[PDB]
Design a protein around this ligand. Structure first.
Ligand SMILES: *[C@@H]1O[C@H](CO)[C@@H](O[C@@H]2O[C@H](CO)[C@@H](O)[C@H](O)[C@H]2NC(C)=O)[C@H](O)[C@H]1NC(C)=O
Ligand SMILES: *[C@@H]1O[C@H](CO)[C@@H](O[C@@H]2O[C@H](CO)[C@@H](O)[C@H](O)[C@H]2NC(C)=O)[C@H](O)[C@H]1NC(C)=O
Ligand SMILES: *[C@@H]1O[C@H](CO)[C@@H](O[C@@H]2O[C@H](CO)[C@@H](O)[C@H](O)[C@H]2NC(C)=O)[C@H](O)[C@H]1NC(C)=O
Ligand SMILES: *[C@@H]1O[C@H](CO)[C@@H](O[C@@H]2O[C@H](CO)[C@@H](O)[C@H](O)[C@H]2NC(C)=O)[C@H](O)[C@H]1NC(C)=O
Ligand SMILES: *[C@@H]1O[C@H](CO)[C@@H](O[C@@H]2O[C@H](CO)[C@@H](O)[C@H](O)[C@H]2NC(C)=O)[C@H](O)[C@H]1NC(C)=O
Ligand SMILES: *[C@@H]1O[C@H](CO)[C@@H](O[C@@H]2O[C@H](CO)[C@@H](O)[C@H](O)[C@H]2NC(C)=O)[C@H](O)[C@H]1NC(C)=O
Ligand SMILES: *[C@@H]1O[C@H](CO)[C@@H](O[C@@H]2O[C@H](CO)[C@@H](O)[C@H](O)[C@H]2NC(C)=O)[C@H](O)[C@H]1NC(C)=O
Ligand SMILES: *[C@@H]1O[C@H](CO)[C@@H](O[C@@H]2O[C@H](CO)[C@@H](O)[C@H](O)[C@H]2NC(C)=O)[C@H](O)[C@H]1NC(C)=O
Ligand SMILES: *[C@@H]1O[C@H](CO)[C@@H](O)[C@H](O)[C@H]1NC(C)=O
Ligand SMILES: *[C@@H]1O[C@H](CO)[C@@H](O)[C@H](O)[C@H]1NC(C)=O
Ligand SMILES: *[C@@H]1O[C@H](CO)[C@@H](O)[C@H](O)[C@H]1NC(C)=O
Ligand SMILES: *[C@@H]1O[C@H](CO)[C@@H](O)[C@H](O)[C@H]1NC(C)=O
Ligand SMILES: *[C@@H]1O[C@H](CO)[C@@H](O)[C@H](O)[C@H]1NC(C)=O
Ligand SMILES: *[C@@H]1O[C@H](CO)[C@@H](O)[C@H](O)[C@H]1NC(C)=O
Ligand SMILES: *[C@@H]1O[C@H](CO)[C@@H](O)[C@H](O)[C@H]1NC(C)=O
Ligand SMILES: *[C@@H]1O[C@H](CO)[C@@H](O)[C@H](O)[C@H]1NC(C)=O
Ligand SMILES: *[C@@H]1O[C@H](CO)[C@@H](O)[C@H](O)[C@H]1NC(C)=O
Ligand SMILES: *[C@@H]1O[C@H](CO)[C@@H](O)[C@H](O)[C@H]1NC(C)=O
Lengths: 139, 137, 139, 137, 139, 137
């Protein structure tokens, strides 16, 4: 199970998920979060293997962009922002944890609009839908 | 139950550029832990000559590729480089430059200035994030 | 459930499907119809929010193309057309309604070749396969 | 049972261009409800000089961006603009222009002309559809 | 069931799979093998429906590349190569056959690193996971 | 039980270029069963003039389009064409040309040469494959 450390989290120390939840990151291509995981893995591999960089590697990241991230989703978020609809900022992610057991869910990024993180009521319906998903996951 | 998590992008300080905003007239892009570019909205002219030489800059070979690759890809999507410094200005074409600048950050101003600076804890509220450069690239 | 009005259909007035059928337009990306839905949604949002278009917004559509549609499928259809195989014209679609109950299926587009719409005899295999698909979906 | 449906693309008359053909030598592309471009095949030359100005056209600023943005995209993938009118001539290179024209519509002809016209109910059998411009773009 | 001839295999004559296994080539887009099937089918169609080529067609393949193959996966393999990780060479593929019955699996390509084909010991985890996948598929 | 299969790409000898490598300084790309290009690393200069005519090459119309489409896309991502032959050399810019050459194959050398040759059973251990050209396209 992929885990997140305290150096890549704010106000958190060790908050991490199951492998079966992260398994959705190579099947569905409408998730806003898996791009961050891919960037983190690329960063770890680059700083580990390629040693002693000579003042940054601009071409390496220029070429990894075409291979790791979803440019269509980034352009979709940009178009949504310039057209004044709640969009994504790539910094806040919400999920469910089911504290009784421990099984969790893949986060969906928060909705930002007008420079204010709109509250849980304004998208609460989505919450319920995902809950139904875990209902379908109860069996 | 619902929980929220926020990601610290400064772990990408190497191998990825980072950007964050300070005021509506100032923006900062950062490469490494010592060098970055200031994107400043202003109504003050710094250079006069109307000739930007960029091929000569790369032919100089006394420069840093990482610093000016970003301004190159900004130009793709006047200048004065004497002495090795970096200084680009766009005078006010306006729609494109403002759209690119707003793309980084994700009127009554005459100039936008790109210049070299040393890293400081500049941006107050907006945390660094690499999404802007991934969008421009 | 997404419902199509009388202004966007010819010879029809109201013809619409369950939301569970439309739910396949963000999972499977081999569908020829969901691109039309995305264009209709973009058009509605553009005419609702952005007001008083000053002689069309060319850049808005030029950048929504990169974010909403599937250029690979368009080029596949163009290659089929220039290579003399039945292709799609993005104007004719066929589906199943199951008139006893009302449960329906996502339309697949018609096959146009040599400027003539080939009849149900020349692609009955797809009809049988989709009928088997709903037979499985019955359980 | 099996049922069929046909979509009316004229609801996209704004925010997306629509194209529909009339005869094998004529094509029509439409912006808004008043203005469009004719893509015509002919054996008669309308201009003589072999100089096509496009930068001067955009620098004129007395034009309509939506009309010649499409022709700019067509150029990327001679001319005569005096008075504000639009008229682009391709004389017959032939393979590319015919392939692009056939791409829109989805020999022994001399010239292809792009010209400004007012909307009329031109196309006889082919209903309008925006797929051609989505392909060219 | 798609079948491969003796002209497109080395050391083999006839070796082919069930159509149900080939069916995964239009749903999951992380498979290294389906690109070769698309290339083979395109080659057959081009040599059949177009006769007497005028010394090879370059634009037709240039445009079929954009419509048939996955450029992101190719760039991923290239980035792995330039960064000293096992990658794919597009020439060797391994699968499971279940000789008692006959039901097979979609081949996953071999991992090449340092100019040597690493053996089954260094990727036995993938073998075990896929065997578990067929075990689940047994039901 | 585990089983393995290898693919023979020579059935793609038409409709797709194939390429395979022979020695760390030689590469071969094939179009058809009669013509191909040699990519050679050498210390010997073949041409002296510093002029590479390419527009006149296509304007000549006495050539093979398939042969030099590959070199055109290589240039996009000096020369001597007199008599109809094909001969291109890159001298050591070096990083880009060597990276493209390595992209085909998937120091202290002075020149990389692209030249026309007739097909022979050249490549010793590496079987032909079209993946390199798909990547560089
Ligand atoms: C945002 O912050 C910058 C940085 O402090 C402000 O720029 C200063 O502007 C004053 C004039 O009011 C100058 O005297 C300072 O020298 C500037 N600081 C510099 C150049 O570092 C800016 O005014 C602030 N507000 C806006 C809207 O940009
Ligand atoms: C730089 O120039 C702009 C104009 O392009 C200035 O904006 C004007 O500021 C004056 C202040 O008296 C206002 O009356 C005008 O309405 C503003 N707009 C225009 C179009 O003139 C801007 O203030 C200048 N920069 C600074 C620092 O003063
Ligand atoms: C941005 O980079 C340029 C190029 O090196 C710097 O300009 C020179 O930097 C060296 C090294 O500190 C100094 O010795 C020179 O005096 C600088 N040139 C001039 C004309 O002053 C520039 O200083 C850098 N920017 C910052 C803020 O340090
Ligand atoms: C298709 O329709 C056009 C439009 O009517 C025809 O163009 C006409 O051609 C005749 C003969 O040259 C001219 O006298 C008319 O002035 C043309 N019409 C217009 C509006 O200019 C065309 O002939 C028809 N057939 C073909 C094959 O294009
Ligand atoms: C296409 O656009 C051009 C540019 O506006 C038109 O040319 C002028 O249009 C105005 C508006 O009616 C007329 O008053 C001028 O006389 C036109 N100029 C010339 C030289 O005739 C052109 O008319 C438009 N096309 C059509 C068919 O109306
Ligand atoms: C790899 O093989 C090539 C081809 O045999 C060698 O290159 C030269 O090829 C010519 C024939 O075209 C011979 O006459 C030369 O003797 C070969 N060698 C040299 C140094 O010119 C090449 O040497 C071989 N080895 C390497 C490392 O490339
Ligand atoms: C091609 O010429 C270059 C000359 O630059 C040769 O490189 C030299 O190689 C020797 C021994 O390998 C070194 O001692 C020199 O320092 C190299 N010169 C440099 C690096 O400038 C190269 O070996 C030649 N290749 C062949 C096949 O003869
Ligand atoms: C590569 O192509 C060029 C262009 O056709 C060939 O150059 C001429 O080819 C013809 C056809 O055999 C000969 O009659 C001429 O004598 C060639 N020109 C010269 C100057 O020799 C070239 O021969 C081709 N390459 C090979 C290896 O055959
Ligand atoms: C879910 O709750 C448990 C309770 O101890 C905690 O350990 C775990 O970290 C929580 N999950 C996440 C993702 O924070
Ligand atoms: C830029 O600003 C204005 C143009 O609007 C002009 O007065 C000034 O001289 C220009 N300077 C340069 C270097 O282009
Ligand atoms: C560099 O820019 C200056 C600006 O005054 C110009 O005079 C000079 O010709 C330029 N050098 C070039 C383009 O090589
Ligand atoms: C299927 O038939 C029912 C019968 O009333 C009708 O209401 C419904 O609209 C039909 N489905 C479609 C998609 O038109
Ligand atoms: C623009 O028109 C002028 C006027 O004849 C002509 O001299 C010039 O060559 C034209 N420019 C182009 C690029 O065609
Ligand atoms: C275009 O057509 C022919 C060239 O094939 C030539 O006679 C004619 O003058 C050309 N005119 C222009 C404006 O290019
Ligand atoms: C145009 O001229 C060509 C001459 O090559 C001729 O073949 C063709 O029929 C002419 N077009 C018409 C409509 O007459
Ligand atoms: C699996 O084994 C059977 C045994 O007869 C063989 O016929 C078949 O070809 C094998 N599968 C493949 C894909 O080769
Ligand atoms: C290429 O090689 C060197 C430059 O490194 C130079 O001596 C030679 O003349 C150059 N030749 C050409 C054709 O550019
Ligand atoms: C093309 O060839 C001519 C004839 O020698 C020569 O003068 C010119 O410099 C060459 N140009 C290029 C770009 O090769």
């Amino acid at each position: 199970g992929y885990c997140l450390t305290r150096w890549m989290l704010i106000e958190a120390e060790l908050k991490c998920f199951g492998n079966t939840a992260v398994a959705k990151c190579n099947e569905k291509h409408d998730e806003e979060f898996c791009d961050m995981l891919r960037l983190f893995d690329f960063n770890k591999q680059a700083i580990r293997r390629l040693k002693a960089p000579a003042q940054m590697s601009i071409q390496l990241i220029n070429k990894a962009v075409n291979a790791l991230i979803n440019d269509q989703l980034i352009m979709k978020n940009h178009l949504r922002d310039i057209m004044c609809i709640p969009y994504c900022n790539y910094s806040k992610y919400w999920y469910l944890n089911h504290t009784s057991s421990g099984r969790t869910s893949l986060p969906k990024c928060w909705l930002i609009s007008n420079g204010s993180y709109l509250n849980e009521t304004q998208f609460s319906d989505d919450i319920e839908q995902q809950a139904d998903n875990m209902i379908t996951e109860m069996l | 139950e619902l929980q929220t998590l926020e990601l610290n992008m400064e772990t990408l300080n190497m191998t990825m550029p980072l950007s964050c905003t300070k005021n509506s007239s100032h923006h900062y892009i950062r490469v490494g832990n010592e060098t970055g570019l200031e994107l400043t909205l202003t109504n003050t002219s710094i250079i006069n000559h109307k000739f930007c030489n960029l091929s000569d800059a790369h032919k100089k070979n006394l420069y840093d590729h990482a610093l000016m690759s970003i301004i190159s890809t900004f130009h793709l999507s006047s200048c004065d480089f004497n002495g090795g410094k970096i200084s680009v200005q766009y005078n006010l074409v306006a729609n494109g430059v403002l759209q690119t600048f707003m793309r980084m950050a994700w009127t009554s101003y005459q100039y936008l200035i790109i210049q070299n600076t040393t890293w400081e804890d500049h941006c107050q509220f907006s945390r660094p994030s690499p999404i802007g450069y991934l969008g421009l690239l």
